[PDB]
Structure 1
Amino acid sequence: MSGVLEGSNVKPVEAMTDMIANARRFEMQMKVITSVDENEGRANQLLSM
């Protein structure tokens, strides 16, 4: 079909929901990392005495 151009098929709604999901997933992972760090911190006191 001549006389016509074609744009990008970037669905903005799925991109928006993807970004929201990514942010929330990232911060859940950050909580996991924090808990594991502080666990190792507590546990490294077994080796004393």
Structure 2
Amino acid sequence: MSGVLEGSNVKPVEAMTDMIANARRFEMQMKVITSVDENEGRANQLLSM
């Protein structure tokens, strides 16, 4: 068809849901990292005889 230009197909609902899910997943992974680090910090005293 002549006289019409096609735009993008970026769905905003999908983008918003993806951002929410990404933020929540990032926070969960940061919490896991903190837990593991604290556990190793507590565990690295056994070596004291």
Q: Shorter-chain TM-score category?
A: over 0.9
Which sections of structure 2, spanning at least 5 residues, go unmatched?
none
Residue 5 of structure 2: aligned partner:
5
Q: What is the CA-CA distance between 1:28 and the residue it aligns to?
A: 0.1
Which sections of structure 1, spanning at least 5 residues, go unmatched?
none
Moved over 2 A (4+): none
Residue 22 of structure 2: aligned partner:
22
**TM-score, normalised via structure 2 length:** 0.97
Q: What is the CA-CA distance between 1:40 and the residue it aligns to?
A: 0.3
**Secondary structure at 1:45's aligned position in 2?**
coil
Q: What is the CA-CA distance between 1:36 and the residue it aligns to?
A: 0.2
**Secondary structure at 1:32's aligned position in 2?**
helix
Q: What is the CA-CA distance between 1:35 and the residue it aligns to?
A: 0.1
